[PDB]
Symmetry: C4
Subunit: 92 residues, 4 copies
């Protein structure tokens, strides 16, 4: 379970690193903005303060969402159930 | 399972083709923008860089969301569990 | 199951009627825009082409989301599994 | 179950209080706007009428989403299944 969580943690980090590199380079965002945009995208918040303006950016974003959402929410779920949940119960 | 995934893959593609055709035609978007908007809508990201401006567009969008979300996330789930998950485990 | 689906269908309609009335009245939207905004909100798309500008609107929106999301996605799920799924299998 | 719901209710309130304080202070929003933005963020609606403009705001928002989504939707689920569901059945 801790190994489950470690792996999803690492995969999430790699997914966000890829988005950070792509959006900084192709869409010209500052790295911090590119990370923030990647997170806002894959958690499906989607403020739209940043969004891809190039066709390369839009196509990547389509594929990035489809491949990354499953991982990100997998990680969030394991975070909530295997980490937050026990500490909450512990505090009781 | 591979047949499960093939079918949801095909249905997702058809759903996105329909949106691409509708939004290009009625909302005047370039086909690539219409595809990108369809994806951004049905994955519930919703940047709002594109959004329907006509009443025909808004009504279609209501019905498109209700009918398409279930399919798109079904596909994402099977992608994550039946495709990404095994290759990840394989890499270990 | 058909009774399950009928009930969630009716409840969803009532939830969207309430939002349509509220946003038309308090936020001044045309009824069609108010319906479209209610749907875009409760499915968590959130384009932001419309959003509440009054404090009454923001407070209602907080409570509307918390109470309506569970119903809307319940309906979407039953739609997908109890309606779309069988017709898809039938087409095969 | 009522104890389950009470706890998630309290935790959700604390999570929203934290966001309200952070966004009022660091992003300069009025408290009501900060609460509304916190809710719009953690339910993944993401209108983008408000969004963090400072780097401190963007970094907090990344961490806030990852930690808060699981709690907020946990609460929504228990609300829907353990509160709305029985009263609906009761009305029948
Ligand atoms: K959004
Ligand atoms: K914008
Ligand atoms: K916009
Ligand atoms: K969303
Ligand atoms: K969204
Ligand atoms: K938006
Ligand atoms: K806007
Ligand atoms: K905006």
């Amino acid at each position: 379970k801790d190994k489950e969580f470690q792996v999803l943690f690492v995969l999430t980090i790699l997914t966000l690193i890829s988005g950070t590199i792509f959006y900084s380079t192709v869409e010209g965002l500052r790295p911090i903005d590119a990370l923030y945009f990647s997170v806002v995208t894959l958690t499906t918040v989607g403020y739209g303060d940043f969004s891809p303006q190039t066709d390369f950016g839009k196509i990547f974003t389509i594929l990035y969402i489809f491949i990354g959402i499953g991982l990100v929410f997998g990680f969030i779920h394991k975070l909530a159930v295997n980490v937050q949940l026990p500490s909450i119960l512990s505090n009781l």
